[PDB]
Amino acid sequence: DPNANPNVDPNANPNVDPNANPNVDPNANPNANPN
């Protein structure tokens, strides 16, 4: 969009989000981290 309205917008809901998977996500590197 050549004329998108730039910047960070106000007018959003600033109150965490009680609609998310509360379970452990079994999709992460299970290996030791060499860093």
Epitope: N31, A32, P34, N35
Partner: antibody
Framework: VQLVESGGGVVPPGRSLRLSCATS????????MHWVRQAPGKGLEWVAI????????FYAASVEGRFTISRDNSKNTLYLQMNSLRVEDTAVYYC??????????????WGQGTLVTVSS | SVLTQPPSVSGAPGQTVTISCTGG?????????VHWYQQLPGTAPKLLIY???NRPSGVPDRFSGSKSGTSASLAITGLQAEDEADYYC????????????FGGGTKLTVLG
């Protein structure tokens, strides 16, 4: 800070060889160490890391299971034991002192290097 | 080799020569800090740049660099004959088991 490689030379493939570095000028027991190598005419390749207390070790995929890294804090000495040396393991091996910056790490002090040649 | 460097760069003494290092989403665009090493013809690599912009007190203020997106770069100004060397970039690739990864190195030739 001195790091001094020793134990290079030439062996037939299939033989074992043991390299080491003596260090001085810093407290050896407070730092982790790295080994890297450079095949003649090639760039640098990371080989292995050992944690300051010896608790963790990581190896490059191309050497894991053949190489062992170890250290003796009371002797200020870092060792690398290579088993089943292959022709492809010909390289100059170097010691480096581990350092860490923020999201990634780096070596700050380096040794001089020593040459290991594998050939029949 | 997961970081790409040009094999060779050059310039006349006094000119500014830059050496690029291009990675991808797993290493540079991933936020891992980029480091640079300098190797002279018969010795061990020396840390030149660390932390993308910082340098050891033993490095002339002729060397500097930057990081942006998946790109990184080393700029050498006031090129001297003594800068003939191999320069390497280093970072961390989250897809690999090793702590460090290196580019193939770039040789800087000073056209004396």
């Amino acid at each position: 800070v001195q790091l001094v490689e020793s134990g290079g030379g030439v062996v037939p493939p299939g033989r074992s060889l043991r390299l080491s570095c003596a260090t001085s000028g810093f407290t050896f027991s407070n730092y982790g160490m790295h080994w890297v190598r450079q095949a003649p005419g090639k760039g640098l390749e990371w080989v292995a890391i050992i944690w300051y207390d010896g608790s963790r070790n990581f190896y490059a995929a191309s050497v894991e299971g053949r190489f062992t890294i170890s250290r003796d804090n009371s002797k200020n000495t870092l060792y690398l034991q290579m088993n089943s040396l292959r022709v492809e393991d010909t390289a100059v091996y170097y010691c480096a002192r581990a350092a860490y910056y923020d999201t990634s790490g780096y070596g700050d002090y380096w040794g001089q290097g020593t040459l290991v040649t594998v050939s029949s | 080799s997961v970081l790409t460097q040009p094999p060779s760069v050059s310039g006349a003494p006094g000119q500014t020569v830059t050496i690029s290092c291009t990675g991808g989403s797993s290493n540079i665009g991933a936020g891992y800090d980029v480091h640079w090493y300098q190797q002279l013809p018969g010795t061990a690599p020396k840390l030149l740049i660390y932390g993308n912009i910082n340098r050891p007190s033993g490095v002339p203020d002729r060397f500097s660099g930057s990081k942006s997106g998946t790109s990184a770069s080393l700029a050498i100004t006031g090129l001297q004959a003594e800068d003939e060397a191999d320069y390497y970039c280093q970072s961390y690739d989250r897809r690999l088991s090793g702590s460090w990864v290196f580019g193939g190195g770039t040789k800087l030739t000073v056209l004396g």
